[PDB]
Amino acid sequence: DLKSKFLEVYSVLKSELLNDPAFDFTDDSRLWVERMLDYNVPGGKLNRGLSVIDSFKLLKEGKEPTDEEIFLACVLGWCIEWLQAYFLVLDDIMDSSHTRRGQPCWFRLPKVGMIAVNDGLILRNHIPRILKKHFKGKPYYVDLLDLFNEVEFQTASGQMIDLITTLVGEKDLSKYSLPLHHRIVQYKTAYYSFYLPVACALVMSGENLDNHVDVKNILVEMGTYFQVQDDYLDCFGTDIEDFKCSWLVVKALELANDEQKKLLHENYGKEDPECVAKVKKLYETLNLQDVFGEYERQSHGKLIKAIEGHSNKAVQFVLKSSLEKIYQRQK
Amino acid sequence: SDLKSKFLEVYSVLKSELLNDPAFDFTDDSRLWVERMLDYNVPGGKLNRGLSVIDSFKLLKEGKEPTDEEIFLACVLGWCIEWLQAYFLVLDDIMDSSHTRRGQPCWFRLPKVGMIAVNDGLILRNHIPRILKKHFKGKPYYVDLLDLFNEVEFQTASGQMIDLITTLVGEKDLSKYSLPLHHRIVQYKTAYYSFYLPVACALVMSGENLDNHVDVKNILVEMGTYFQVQDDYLDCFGDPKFIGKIGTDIEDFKCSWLVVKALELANDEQKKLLHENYGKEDPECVAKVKKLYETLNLQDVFGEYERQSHGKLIKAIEGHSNKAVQFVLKSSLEKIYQRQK
């Protein structure tokens, strides 16, 4: 129903981009861009993109959204998926990764290499082209541009602190802390994964985003909790191997004794299954599955009370639906 | 100079504002990181594109003295152009596996940076909206600024794409290289951001609608194409002391204007000579290619191209109905006509 229409809208947007009047395409560059698009953009699960349409429908009370609206919401969802693909291509380059969704990373294919860097740029610059094409006549056009620019800035800044914390500070693991993890996760994932889709739906609904700081705070907290879920599922996956500032290692560094904190310092993300076995058993000995369960339900309580504090029924429906889609997930 | 010093003072102001940005939770580490990256990559060049914004705005302000506030806003737009260029240059140095820029190691070459520089490029680009929002959000031409910068960035990235896939992908047949492909690469990769964008910023500040200045855009794009032809010529026949570096376009198998004109002017033996020497590093082949350029008299062909381009541009410029616009375009032309650096 909606998902099929979303993929159809992908085909529409790709056609428009490959007939863009701002660039003089030839067969070579048109085929290059179309292969790059098909390899990097539509292959994911597209949850963030479709949540735009979901949120827009719930904010239109319990009524029917029209046809234009459905198309527009799909276009904004695809803008979010384009943003994510743009970040992922460059992240795979920076992480020297090999595989994504079971296929080689874009930059790993022999005819691309570091060209993929520029491809990342292309992906990002497709978002204005799309927006201009479908929202230039709308009165909230500039709000869209400001929203996407600010969320992109925040995601890049979160990636920066993740990079510097890890690669520039794996001397002392003491560095990893609970506020540092919270900040990294809030800026790198929460704004674009949870705030941005609902903010798109709100802007389309005619709302001023400056009157919805409550919604933004709640969604940022919910995204932090989502990424904690991700950190937990990576181990219970190469976070330990990659010396990442995971929630699990941070909680372990706060709950262990001097001997177990010595164990962590002397076996964290330093190659070999050996080293990765010791970390997992330290996690078991501290019973980090019960700490994560307690954190999980406690966060759930926080979020539901905060959500029921809001004065708009549709907003409550949106936030409650977002929460239950991830509550006690295994994937 | 007076205005260059004021321009660098405006850089300091913009950097302070960016390091106190309310949209991000800075700590000592990331604030020092962003400041070390900004100072290393943004203010160290010649800032010609940035300062041309102020020059163009003052030329368009026929008759009525610009305020200090207007000069500051023009400086801000010039710095946005320099930020865009810095972002592109950081990523280009990564893609080209370069080693040094302006006599110092490339940002990604420093041991504590490496591939972090990729994300640093992103940071640089996303500084441009932060700056614009900070200083122009209340202006009625704010959205025109955003559209201008987004579209020029799209066109620059696309020009880089066709340059990369022309040079790197496929086999390395030198036949593909042609004059239309060179024109397309050069127009989209350099001309829009180096020549159109500064003047367009000055025009937007003047209250103009850019949709009524397509002629200006055409003239500036053609002028930027001519500028990059000059750069291609000087990369081989220029002076390394005056330019700053030694040109390696022949080694790097670039779709230069010189090799294209050589392939259109040579005979079968000289085109085979070109096929068997262009694009390898060792100076024997480079010297054969350069002396072929000499025997083909590519210097005099370039001189004739330059004076034909000058005549064309002068005629097109004097076709325009606004004298201030004509002054802007002629000032842009005479700064580069017969330049040596």
Numbering used by the authors:
A (entry chain B): 3 to 238, 248 to 342
B (entry chain A): 2 to 342
Reported in the publication:
Prenyltransferases, also known as isoprenyl diphosphate synthases, catalyze the sequential condensation of a basic five-carbon building block (C5), the isopentenyl diphosphate (IPP), to synthesize prenyl precursors of isoprenoid metabolites and isoprene polymers, collectively called polyisoprene. Ultrahigh molecular weight cis-1,4-polyisoprene and trans-1,4-polyisoprene (TPI), which are the principal components of natural rubber and gutta-percha, respectively, are also isoprenoid metabolites that are assumed to be synthesized by specialized prenyltransferases. These prenyltransferases are divided into two major groups, the cis-1,4-prenyltransferases (CPTs) and trans-1,4-prenyltransferases (TPTs), based on the stereochemistry of the double bond formed during IPP condensation. To investigate the molecular properties of the EuTPT proteins, we determined the three-dimensional structures of EuTPT3 and EuFPS1 using X-ray crystallography. Similar to EuFPS1 and other prenyltransferases, the EuTPT3 subunits were composed of 10 core helices (α1-α10) with a deep pocket that included two DDxxD motifs responsible for substrates binding.
It should be noted that we previously characterized EuTPT2 and EuTPT4 as E. ulmoides FPS proteins, referred to as EuFPS1 and EuFPS2, respectively. In the tetrad analysis, ScFPS, EuTPT2, and EuTPT4 rescued Δfps lethality. The superimposition parameters suggested that the dimeric architecture of EuTPS3 was highly conserved and unlikely to be caused by crystal packing. Interestingly, the dimeric architecture of EuTPT3 substantially differed from that of EuFPS1, which formed a conventional TPT dimer. In EuTPT3, α6 of one subunit interacted with α5 and α6 of the neighboring subunit to form a four-helix bundle, whereas, in EuFPS1, α4 of one subunit was inserted between α5 and α6 of the neighboring subunit to form a six-helix bundle of α4–α6 at the dimer interface. As a result, the neighboring subunit of EuFPS1 was tilted at an angle of ~45° compared with that of EuTPT3. The structural difference is related to the chain length determination residues, which are conserved as bulky amino acids among FPSs, including EuFPS1 and 2. Specifically, the equivalent positions of residues Cys94 and Ala95 on α4 in EuTPT3 are occupied by Tyr88 and Phe89 in EuFPS1. The side chains of those residues protrude between α5 and α6, resulting in a marked bending of α5. The residues equivalent to Tyr88 and Phe89 in EuFPS1 are highly conserved among all FPSs. The TPT-type dimer formed a larger hollow at the dimer interface and supported a hydrophobic tunnel reaching through the bottom region, whereas the bulky side chains of Tyr88 and Phe89 appeared to prevent the formation of a tunnel in EuFPS1.
